[PDB]
Design an enzyme around this catalytic site. Sequence first.
Site, PDB file in Angstrom:
ATOM      1  N   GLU A 148       1.010  -1.356  -0.082  1.00  0.00           N
ATOM      2  CA  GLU A 148      -0.241  -0.144  -0.071  1.00  0.00           C
ATOM      3  C   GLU A 148       1.039   1.363  -0.395  1.00  0.00           C
ATOM      4  O   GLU A 148       2.177   1.142   0.537  1.00  0.00           O
ATOM      5  CB  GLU A 148      -1.088  -0.313   1.414  1.00  0.00           C
ATOM      6  N   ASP A 178      -0.741  -4.438  -3.779  1.00  0.00           N
ATOM      7  CA  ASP A 178      -1.880  -4.348  -2.167  1.00  0.00           C
ATOM      8  C   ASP A 178      -2.914  -3.710  -3.034  1.00  0.00           C
ATOM      9  O   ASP A 178      -2.689  -2.136  -3.163  1.00  0.00           O
ATOM     10  CB  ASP A 178      -0.818  -4.186  -1.086  1.00  0.00           C
ATOM     11  N   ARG A 179      -3.661  -3.866  -3.515  1.00  0.00           N
ATOM     12  CA  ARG A 179      -5.104  -3.273  -3.689  1.00  0.00           C
ATOM     13  C   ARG A 179      -4.819  -3.161  -5.677  1.00  0.00           C
ATOM     14  O   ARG A 179      -3.912  -2.575  -6.225  1.00  0.00           O
ATOM     15  CB  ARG A 179      -4.912  -1.337  -3.446  1.00  0.00           C
ATOM     16  N   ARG A 190      -4.669  -4.398  13.992  1.00  0.00           N
ATOM     17  CA  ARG A 190      -3.963  -3.682  13.681  1.00  0.00           C
ATOM     18  C   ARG A 190      -3.288  -2.052  14.099  1.00  0.00           C
ATOM     19  O   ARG A 190      -4.048  -1.566  14.813  1.00  0.00           O
ATOM     20  CB  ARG A 190      -4.513  -2.580  12.109  1.00  0.00           C
ATOM     21  N   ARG A 249      -1.711   1.796  15.772  1.00  0.00           N
ATOM     22  CA  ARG A 249      -2.836   3.469  15.274  1.00  0.00           C
ATOM     23  C   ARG A 249      -2.317   4.234  14.386  1.00  0.00           C
ATOM     24  O   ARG A 249      -1.102   4.212  14.677  1.00  0.00           O
ATOM     25  CB  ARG A 249      -2.644   3.461  17.060  1.00  0.00           C
ATOM     26  N   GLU A 254      -7.251   5.759  12.109  1.00  0.00           N
ATOM     27  CA  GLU A 254      -8.123   5.490  11.226  1.00  0.00           C
ATOM     28  C   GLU A 254      -9.377   5.626  11.615  1.00  0.00           C
ATOM     29  O   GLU A 254      -9.366   5.268  12.463  1.00  0.00           O
ATOM     30  CB  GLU A 254      -7.693   4.486   9.965  1.00  0.00           C
TER      31      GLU A 254
HETATM   32  N1  LIG Z   1      -3.832 -15.000   9.026  1.00  0.00           N
HETATM   33  C1  LIG Z   1      -3.615 -14.257  10.055  1.00  0.00           C
HETATM   34  N2  LIG Z   1      -4.323 -14.617  11.260  1.00  0.00           N
HETATM   35  C2  LIG Z   1      -3.916 -13.725  12.420  1.00  0.00           C
HETATM   36  N3  LIG Z   1      -3.823 -12.374  12.177  1.00  0.00           N
HETATM   37  C3  LIG Z   1      -4.140 -12.022  10.894  1.00  0.00           C
HETATM   38  C4  LIG Z   1      -3.912 -12.311   9.840  1.00  0.00           C
HETATM   39  N4  LIG Z   1      -3.474 -11.561   8.762  1.00  0.00           N
HETATM   40  C5  LIG Z   1      -3.272 -10.190   9.214  1.00  0.00           C
HETATM   41  N5  LIG Z   1      -3.557 -10.534  10.630  1.00  0.00           N
HETATM   42  C6  LIG Z   1      -3.519  -8.776  11.511  1.00  0.00           C
HETATM   43  O1  LIG Z   1      -4.591  -8.425  11.469  1.00  0.00           O
HETATM   44  C7  LIG Z   1      -4.299  -7.323  10.815  1.00  0.00           C
HETATM   45  C8  LIG Z   1      -4.127  -6.466   9.747  1.00  0.00           C
HETATM   46  O2  LIG Z   1      -4.066  -7.692   8.792  1.00  0.00           O
HETATM   47  P1  LIG Z   1      -3.542  -6.537   7.322  1.00  0.00           P
HETATM   48  O3  LIG Z   1      -2.039  -7.493   6.480  1.00  0.00           O
HETATM   49  O4  LIG Z   1      -2.977  -5.234   7.865  1.00  0.00           O
HETATM   50  O5  LIG Z   1      -5.027  -6.359   7.146  1.00  0.00           O
HETATM   51  P2  LIG Z   1      -5.425  -5.560   5.458  1.00  0.00           P
HETATM   52  O6  LIG Z   1      -4.145  -6.165   4.297  1.00  0.00           O
HETATM   53  O7  LIG Z   1      -6.184  -6.794   4.505  1.00  0.00           O
HETATM   54  O8  LIG Z   1      -6.083  -4.681   5.361  1.00  0.00           O
HETATM   55  C9  LIG Z   1      -3.066  -7.295  11.599  1.00  0.00           C
HETATM   56  O9  LIG Z   1      -2.948  -6.514  13.142  1.00  0.00           O
HETATM   57  C10 LIG Z   1      -2.007  -8.088  11.604  1.00  0.00           C
HETATM   58  O10 LIG Z   1      -1.211  -8.972  12.075  1.00  0.00           O
HETATM   59  C1  LIG Z   2      -7.352   1.995  -0.446  1.00  0.00           C
HETATM   60  C2  LIG Z   2      -7.999   3.388   0.665  1.00  0.00           C
HETATM   61  C3  LIG Z   2      -7.558   2.916   1.744  1.00  0.00           C
HETATM   62  N1  LIG Z   2      -8.974   3.873   2.527  1.00  0.00           N
HETATM   63  C4  LIG Z   2      -8.728   3.840   4.152  1.00  0.00           C
HETATM   64  C5  LIG Z   2      -9.325   2.437   4.978  1.00  0.00           C
HETATM   65  C6  LIG Z   2      -7.722   2.121   5.709  1.00  0.00           C
HETATM   66  O1  LIG Z   2      -8.234   2.796   7.293  1.00  0.00           O
HETATM   67  C7  LIG Z   2      -6.888   2.329   5.154  1.00  0.00           C
HETATM   68  C8  LIG Z   2      -5.327   1.804   4.962  1.00  0.00           C
HETATM   69  O2  LIG Z   2      -5.981   0.813   3.311  1.00  0.00           O
HETATM   70  O3  LIG Z   2      -7.117   3.836   4.481  1.00  0.00           O
HETATM   71  C9  LIG Z   2      -9.258   4.812   1.760  1.00  0.00           C
HETATM   72  O4  LIG Z   2     -10.786   5.356   3.608  1.00  0.00           O
HETATM   73  N2  LIG Z   2     -10.379   4.808   0.574  1.00  0.00           N
HETATM   74  C10 LIG Z   2      -9.008   4.315   0.486  1.00  0.00           C
HETATM   75  O5  LIG Z   2      -9.742   4.405  -1.197  1.00  0.00           O
END
Ligand SMILES: Nc1ncnc2c1ncn2[C@@H]1O[C@H](COP(=O)(O)OP(=O)(O)O)[C@@H](O)[C@H]1O
Ligand SMILES: Cc1cn([C@H]2C[C@H](O)[C@@H](CO)O2)c(=O)[nH]c1=O
Lengths: 330, 323
Positions: free
Chosen positions: A38, A116-117, A174, A176, A179
């Site tokens: 991201e 990523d997205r 996640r 802080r 968000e």
């Molecule tokens: N497979 C998993 N099992 C347990 N916790 C996970 C797993 N994948 C991600 N997490 C936890 O969940 C939270 C969000 O993960 P993240 O990869 O940031 O989600 P996304 O990219 O979809 O927004 C993080 O704190 C991460 O450590």
């Molecule tokens: C990709 C995207 C993420 N987000 C937010 C969701 C999460 O809080 C953070 C990272 O994805 O940003 C938006 O508000 N708009 C967007 O278009």
Amino acid sequence: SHMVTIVRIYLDGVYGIGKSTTGRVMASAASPTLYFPEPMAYWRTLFETDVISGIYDTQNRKQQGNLAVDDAALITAHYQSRFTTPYLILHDHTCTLFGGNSLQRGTQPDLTLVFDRHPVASTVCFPAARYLLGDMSMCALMAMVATLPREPQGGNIVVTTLNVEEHIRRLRTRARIGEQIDITLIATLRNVYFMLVNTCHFLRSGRVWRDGWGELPTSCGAYKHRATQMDAFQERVSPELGDTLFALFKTQELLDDRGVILEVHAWALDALMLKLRNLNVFSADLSGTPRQCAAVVESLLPLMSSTLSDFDSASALERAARTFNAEMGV
Amino acid sequence: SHMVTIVRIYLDGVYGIGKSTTGRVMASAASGGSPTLYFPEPMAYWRTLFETDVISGIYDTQNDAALITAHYQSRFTTPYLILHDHTCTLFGGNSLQRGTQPDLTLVFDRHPVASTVCFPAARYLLGDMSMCALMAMVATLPREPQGGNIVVTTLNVEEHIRRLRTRARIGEQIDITLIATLRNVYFMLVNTCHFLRSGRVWRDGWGELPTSCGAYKHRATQMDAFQERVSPELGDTLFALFKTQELLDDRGVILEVHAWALDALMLKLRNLNVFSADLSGTPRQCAAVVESLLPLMSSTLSDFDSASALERAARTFNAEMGV
Ligand SMILES: Nc1ncnc2c1ncn2[C@@H]1O[C@H](COP(=O)(O)OP(=O)(O)O)[C@@H](O)[C@H]1O
Ligand SMILES: Cc1cn([C@H]2C[C@H](O)[C@@H](CO)O2)c(=O)[nH]c1=O
Ligand SMILES: Nc1ncnc2c1ncn2[C@@H]1O[C@H](COP(=O)(O)OP(=O)(O)O)[C@@H](O)[C@H]1O
Ligand SMILES: Cc1cn([C@H]2C[C@H](O)[C@@H](CO)O2)c(=O)[nH]c1=O
């Protein structure tokens, strides 16, 4: 002399599911795969304003009555535009490099790219959610949707899924950032990402947005309420028009007196339809561990479209992933 | 299926010069020459189709502001992006400078570069929008497919302001400072295209170029400061405003992500065969000046069905975008 086989994946979905974690694991030498993170630094540090706290702060100052609404909707839209920028830049930079000859070859590619997205996340999905929630107007949504770039041949999108309980658990975990963590937002996002998956299935089924448009009810206040309800949408085998992204556009704002969508808005939907065409769609449940999650996505590879690129383009892609990880705070 | 040769022209420039009047004359059978379709400014999209009027809104904003202004500028671009997405599937390929009269001519009132680049650039230079906002807009410029021609309108500033005055009420002010900046920006646009056509890239002279700070922004708002260059240098182009500290590292080197944004801008402009046209004559003469450029313009090879779709598109856009 010859070519590099490439499979590219956009890992996409509601935030907090585990997409980024999965992507890093896939890219980890523990299992040749590049990962494009991201664009966090572009959003947060590269400029004077942080768009993630900005977008939440706007709804905060809307609640606290310091922001007149009206103005909030406009500022919300602008922050949402700023999310897209780095996706547009990356897409513009990489789209020439993948090569052509899109085919499902069923083999292991010479090179795997994990993004990523996809740009659809910031130009359509997040904007659509804000609209459905009343944080943004249809006019503001149109403005974002029109900036979706056309995907060239060979695209694959993997939309992540997760049961609500574990999603909430993970959202709790996640870091802080400031968000917006809002379960109505999450519910709505989850529904919008099902709409996306369904749109892709709808189009691959040989249908177009006009198929069933007449019989579709007008999508007003009632429609928006339902789209904010947890589990109101799901992935469908044969989706109805009503299950896709197209349905939220049959609103009064976009029709003439006689109930007929304006041609200019119809064009906006044709564009949306064409731009999604080259996305081969998949979904991946992420209830497992990070290692199991990556295995789930990897098991999809032999199902995916590959393109044929040359050595020099593949090299530029490696440099692009290196640069992007470096500059975005990977 | 039967083949049809098309010349397309985006007539562009600062508001007030006479572009829309010129394009309507070109479309009129009275101007003779080529059968011509005209696509007007998306006025109703901007003003009446939704709750908010973006023209009134953007000017009212200047009377948090920086963010609202950026969002209004976003809304200007929308109908241009939609129209471009719709019509680009119909022009066909096989772009060449054929020298001959086309079967038909399309005249677009502005290219997407106006709302995504030129007007945002002016607003940024006047301190009404940040660089971050400017990037957001520039990034949404669509790639021009093969065969585009752009004609930038020019006119001595005295007659330019006179044209705005006749039309204006009877005490209504004119944003002279904005107009001054947009005139320079459109010259930068012309220069940029000449610069790219000569085979140069934004990196050419980038190192030697002074960083574009306070002084650059003063020159950029200064009446008559820029002009169309026979042989533009980098500092005469749109690229120059991007060498700012906001986009550089500690060593004053542009970040790769920003460099990519400039590469994209450069590539998106490539298929725009660039011309300027003085509009000091009558509307009939202005139309004739623009149409005299056809032997120098790129044409594409389309077909009867797509040309028919373009005529319907023109008819529809004219109807739906009116008052
Ligand atoms: N497979 C998993 N099992 C347990 N916790 C996970 C797993 N994948 C991600 N997490 C936890 O969940 C939270 C969000 O993960 P993240 O990869 O940031 O989600 P996304 O990219 O979809 O927004 C993080 O704190 C991460 O450590
Ligand atoms: C990709 C995207 C993420 N987000 C937010 C969701 C999460 O809080 C953070 C990272 O994805 O940003 C938006 O508000 N708009 C967007 O278009
Ligand atoms: N060739 C011309 N000579 C004198 N006045 C003109 C001419 N062309 C346009 N005008 C007038 O100048 C004003 C601006 O014209 P318009 O076509 O709206 O310019 P633009 O499209 O560049 O914004 C209008 O009041 C119009 O009637
Ligand atoms: C195309 C465009 C026009 N305008 C203004 C200038 C004129 O007052 C009016 C019509 O062109 O809209 C913008 O502010 N931004 C734009 O992007």
